[PDB]
Design an enzyme around this catalytic site. Structure first.
Site, PDB file in Angstrom:
ATOM      1  N   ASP B 155       0.827  -1.203   0.000  1.00 22.62           N
ATOM      2  CA  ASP B 155       0.000   0.000   0.000  1.00 22.62           C
ATOM      3  C   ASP B 155       0.865   1.257   0.000  1.00 22.62           C
ATOM      4  OD1 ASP B 155      -2.467   1.508   0.187  1.00 22.62           O
ATOM      5  OD2 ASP B 155      -2.009   1.776   2.323  1.00 22.62           O
ATOM      6  N   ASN B 395       6.733  -6.929   6.798  1.00 20.23           N
ATOM      7  CA  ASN B 395       5.526  -6.226   7.232  1.00 20.23           C
ATOM      8  C   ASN B 395       4.302  -6.917   6.655  1.00 20.23           C
ATOM      9  OD1 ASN B 395       4.215  -3.537   8.371  1.00 20.23           O
ATOM     10  ND2 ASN B 395       3.295  -3.914   6.344  1.00 20.23           N
ATOM     11  N   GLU B 396       3.455  -7.458   7.534  1.00 15.46           N
ATOM     12  CA  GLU B 396       2.149  -7.999   7.148  1.00 15.46           C
ATOM     13  C   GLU B 396       2.261  -9.054   6.052  1.00 15.46           C
ATOM     14  OE1 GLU B 396      -0.467  -4.681   6.230  1.00 15.46           O
ATOM     15  OE2 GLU B 396      -0.881  -4.340   8.360  1.00 15.46           O
ATOM     16  N   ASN B 447      -0.025  -4.781  14.052  1.00 10.36           N
ATOM     17  CA  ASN B 447      -0.804  -3.720  13.429  1.00 10.36           C
ATOM     18  C   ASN B 447      -2.277  -4.000  13.685  1.00 10.36           C
ATOM     19  OD1 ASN B 447       1.709  -3.028  12.399  1.00 10.36           O
ATOM     20  ND2 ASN B 447       1.198  -3.460  10.248  1.00 10.36           N
ATOM     21  N   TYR B 449      -6.383  -2.225  13.507  1.00  6.26           N
ATOM     22  CA  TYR B 449      -7.215  -1.187  12.896  1.00  6.26           C
ATOM     23  C   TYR B 449      -8.681  -1.374  13.278  1.00  6.26           C
ATOM     24  CZ  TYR B 449      -3.220   0.482  10.220  1.00  6.26           C
ATOM     25  OH  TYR B 449      -2.008   1.019   9.845  1.00  6.26           O
ATOM     26  N   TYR B 453     -10.881  -0.747   9.595  1.00  4.42           N
ATOM     27  CA  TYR B 453     -11.084  -1.744   8.543  1.00  4.42           C
ATOM     28  C   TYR B 453     -12.139  -2.774   8.925  1.00  4.42           C
ATOM     29  CZ  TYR B 453      -7.022  -0.034   5.958  1.00  4.42           C
ATOM     30  OH  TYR B 453      -6.133   0.738   5.243  1.00  4.42           O
ATOM     31  N   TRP B 530       0.258   4.890  12.606  1.00  7.94           N
ATOM     32  CA  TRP B 530       0.321   4.936  11.149  1.00  7.94           C
ATOM     33  C   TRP B 530      -0.551   6.095  10.679  1.00  7.94           C
ATOM     34  CZ3 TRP B 530       3.521   2.549   8.032  1.00  7.94           C
ATOM     35  CH2 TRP B 530       3.281   2.608   6.651  1.00  7.94           C
ATOM     36  N   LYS B 549      -3.842   8.543   6.317  1.00  5.14           N
ATOM     37  CA  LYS B 549      -3.685   8.285   7.741  1.00  5.14           C
ATOM     38  C   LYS B 549      -2.553   9.093   8.377  1.00  5.14           C
ATOM     39  CE  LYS B 549      -5.881   3.775   7.880  1.00  5.14           C
ATOM     40  NZ  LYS B 549      -5.938   3.626   6.387  1.00  5.14           N
TER      41      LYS B 549
HETATM   42 CL   LIG Z   1      -3.397   1.849   6.280  1.00  8.31          CL
END
Ligand SMILES: [Cl-]
Ligand SMILES: [Cl-]
Lengths: 578, 578
Positions: B155, B395-396, B447, B449, B453, B530, B549
């Site tokens: 992203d 990351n992720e 992480n 959200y 999300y 973030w 963000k």
């Molecule tokens: Cl994000």
């Protein structure tokens, strides 16, 4: 004149809706909503900026059964000069754009048939209407023949039209014309003292609490109602009793009801007392202004505004700079918001000491006469609202002029004579040592804009300048002081660090530093930020599509500083002995 | 390879500036700044969205006196595949868009004459480069012949070009190639242990304090420098000593200097220790992103960013999601900001459990080989920066897959072998009970959200969901936990009450509720919001011109929540035993 209310004995017909509309000497109509300002309704720039007479027209039907009733036609507000015609007959004229007017029209109606109402409204300002202005001819090398400008010196747009509802209502031929209520505290009771204006003389008056229990009664056109263990009205506890007045005569029967609140207001020393407790004002200067409709009444916006007032923790506002709709005062009664209601004496200042305002040609005896009539109309309309706790006779007049002293002495003297039950103020931007008028009021209201209009951008001067200034106001006049305006324009979404003028940060930092000063001064009894919300003004290189000092956007959403104020005011009690 | 630095024995020539630029199989050049991404420089949408090879060209002159010197040509970064030609000769090739590469070019230069450098850069992603992607052909009923798309699942926008400076530098023929420094605390002293890589063998090494006083010295290609009464480097006290290395041989003389910091880092229990004190991370995930230049290095933006970090009270950031320029790490050394530096293993996830990532055809042995080479290049570049205090391997990624376990075991094992002096993490958005990888790292980074999300708009779920989740991470793995990402998109100037998604209020309330949870959990050692600032992404109906963000706008001005964080973090100590 009493607010039109339906009862067992009175009908109310609201003529608000879609009217036909035209401008002077034009035969073609367009559609126009009422109530609303006409300026932002169309895409015709020449109507937006129109100066002169406009004409509203509407058909209505009167029921045959309204014969042998009084029939009243009421216009809530029309800015600024108005004439009302019923089937071509002039039934009343009115001067002043912020108070209602009415006439009895049964002589002119067709019963059981169609009728035509026409309302002329003229937005041309003069120096003897409030607020004042002047139409000026500009025929020089750079302007064509016939170029004219309406000049005016108040900082809100000269919106025009029918701003508050037009209604027709009935009463019996002998009816309750008016009444006055005063509330006192006595031992462990409260007294509601009343007098009724009517051609009738036999009255029963009843007072009911929140649960419809009768707590007091009296037979008499004047009298006193005793309430044992009263629940007092105040910010944070808006208790209302319902007063019912019943005229009982041989041929006539009339009922009028109003919610009232039991509270006292008194200034003593450096304290502003409500119900004998030291109040601290937390709030705003507002405006009657919203998107598209201009100054038109909108109950959606009104209820939204009061919910925001309660959300942010405000307990008060000032009706800058003119009387508001009665609807807003009934809501302030319900919500428990203290109101300083202000006469439309704004713009009495040419920001320039070489141009005198209180002089032949500008503000003179004719203006004074209008101002005095305005105070009479305003107190007559609003004398029974618990939410009104102070009258403001003017905003930022040129009070340093010799002529301002005699002018305002007379205004202040007449206001106190009309209503000895509420304190009086005047809102000043003159220097403390220069005003010749503030020595005559009960509470000092000062507007200060250090680091905005002076030393623009330099937040570091605020504490030095504001503390010195406010101490001089108190040293000279020894009265409670409200910081009645302070703030900064902020475009929503403009951010910076370090803070810059027109950013949300600068607005918050300025306001934060101002109130830090006030907290150190035990004679300051209030803080009113300018303004509640962004509002429209005339166009100028100093106005970024209107005035952007709102704490809320024009669509009633908060800027950064709204959250600062919510947090501060959640910690500040409504009653605070500083 | 050492950062190019001038000295008594080394010259540096910066080739940054205006270059000529063209795309594949085209003969006409345009002008293009270096360093910069090429995507936003022009108004050609077909270049903005270009996929394929581009070519940079520039003339340069080599002084005759550089004969009998080594001449190195260094490219700071070029995304993602690159080839470097000197007078038409290929001097090196490189894979990976976020680390530098260089070659010795004295064999190919014209001394005292004009030379031509050409750099080819290819932004086409594959599944065996990091970050991965795939070029796909789409020739169906709704797409013309030759329609192609570059698909990728990270992203941030696939900016391309020469993102960091191109420079040419000289060394003597026998020269300091590299050195390693490790710092230890011993009794009341600190030790700086060093080893030098060179064909030479006679070295004098000197350490100087802030005032140029010599505090330690040693003769030897390897050795230990003792510092009595050391001043330690840490957030809030960024003390740097200057290490001077002097090669003294018969025919060769070389000097290289670097500022270093004396600090230790260690994880023990649920504590992250810097200089044996319990650290608490306060900071951000950042991106190398700014207006117009894309990912290009800009020291104005870098210094602005560090001043904002100090202003808001941050003490750390993560280099999401790739190694940053060396310039940023030297600044973090100067400012005392702790850095988690992350490998570019982002996008290893098809948000969909039916599409496997760690499988033949996608992330496989070729990808692993590249990842391992990346870790070697990254540690070799940055091993001597005091500001880097932890490595992040990904990351992720899709760490719930069976194939992810063997992949990351090898990555983690190699990273620790290359640098046993710093802890290792991996940044997760997998569920705690599903990741097969977090059990192998030193510190957990998660992480989350909630209310953005998932359960979009419902702030009321945050405390319930976040506390339960973080307690499960600790119960399963018994490691310190950093909340490594959380936040909400906010358009600057979008305001609402009650708060709505995309308003500044919603972003602040979400962040406020998240950190209230963290304060109740003694095993949470960090909060990274973030993101530091709004940054560009590929276009999609979920991205309002990029990722919004940021706590700061893309032009580095604060949103509402920046002020909330400043106030919170001014109250939170850098070292905090929870
Ligand atoms: Cl994000
Ligand atoms: Cl103003």
């Amino acid at each position: 004149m009493l607010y039109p209310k339906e009862s067992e004995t009175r009908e109310v017909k609201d003529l608000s809706g879609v009217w036909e509309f035209r401008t002077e000497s034009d035969k073609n109509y367009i559609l126009m909503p009422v109530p609303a300002s006409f300026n932002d309704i169309t895409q015709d720039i020449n109507l937006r900026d129109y100066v002169g007479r406009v004409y509203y027209k509407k058909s209505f039907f009167i029921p045959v059964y309204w014969k042998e009733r009084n029939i009243f036609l009421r216009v809530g507000a029309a800015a600024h000069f108005s004439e009302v015609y019923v089937n071509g007959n002039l039934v009343t004229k009115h001067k002043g754009g912020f108070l209602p007017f009415e006439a009895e029209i049964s002589k002119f109606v067709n019963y059981g048939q169609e009728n035509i109402i026409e309302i002329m409204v003229d937005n041309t300002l003069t120096w003897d209407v409030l607020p004042p202005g002047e139409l000026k001819v500009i025929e020089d090398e750079m302007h064509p023949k016939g170029y004219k400008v309406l000049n005016y010196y108040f900082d809100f747009f000269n919106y025009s039209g029918i701003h508050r509802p037009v209604v027709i209502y009935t009463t019996p031929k002998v009816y309750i014309k008016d009444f006055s209520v005063i509330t006192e505290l006595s031992n462990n009771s409260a007294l509601v003292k009343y007098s009724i204006e009517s051609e009738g003389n036999n009255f029963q008056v009843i007072l009911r609490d929140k649960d419809k229990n009768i707590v007091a009664e009296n037979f008499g056109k004047s009298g006193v109602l005793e309430v044992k263990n009263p629940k007092l009205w105040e910010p944070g506890n808006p208790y209302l009793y319902n007063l019912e007045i019943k005229l009982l005569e041989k041929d006539n029967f009339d009922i009028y009801r109003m919610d009232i609140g039991i509270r006292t207001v008194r200034v003593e020393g450096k304290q502003f007392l409500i119900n004998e407790k030291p109040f601290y004002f937390k709030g705003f200067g507002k405006h009657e202004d919203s998107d598209i409709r201009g100054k038109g009444l909108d109950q959606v916006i009104n209820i939204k505004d009061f919910n925001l007032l309660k959300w942010i923790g405000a307990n008060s506002f000032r009706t800058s700079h003119y009387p508001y709709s009665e609807e807003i005062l009934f809501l302030a009664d319900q919500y428990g918001i203290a109101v300083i209601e202000e006469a439309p004496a704004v713009g009495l200042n040419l920001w320039n000491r070489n141009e005198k305002v209180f002089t032949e040609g500008r503000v003179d005896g004719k203006t004074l006469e209008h101002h005095l009539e305005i105070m009479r109309e305003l107190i007559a309309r609003d004398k029974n609202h618990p939410s009104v706790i102070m009258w403001s006779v003017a905003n930022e007049a040129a009070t340093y002029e010799d002529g301002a002293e005699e002018y305002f002495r007379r205004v202040i003297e007449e206001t106190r004579r009309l209503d000895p039950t509420r304190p009086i103020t005047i809102v000043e931007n003159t220097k403390a040592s220069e005003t010749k008028v503030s020595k005559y009021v009960d509470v000092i209201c000062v507007n200060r804009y250090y680091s905005w209009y002076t030393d623009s951008g330099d937040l570091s001067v605020i504490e030095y300048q504001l503390e010195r200034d406010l101490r001089e106001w108190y040293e000279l006049y020894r009265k409670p002081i409200i910081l009645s305006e302070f703030g900064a324009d902020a475009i929503s979404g403009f951010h910076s660090d370090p803070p810059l003028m027109f950013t949300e940060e600068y607005q918050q930092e300025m306001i934060k530093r101002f109130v830090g000063v006030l907290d150190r001064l035990d004679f300051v009894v209030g803080e009113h930020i300018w303004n509640f919300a962004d509002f429209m003004t005339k166009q100028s290189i100093t106005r970024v599509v209107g005035n952007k000092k709102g704490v809320f956007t024009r669509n009633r959403q908060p800027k950064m500083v709204a959250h600062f104020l919510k947090e501060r005011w959640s910690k500040l009690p409504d009653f605070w002995e500083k």
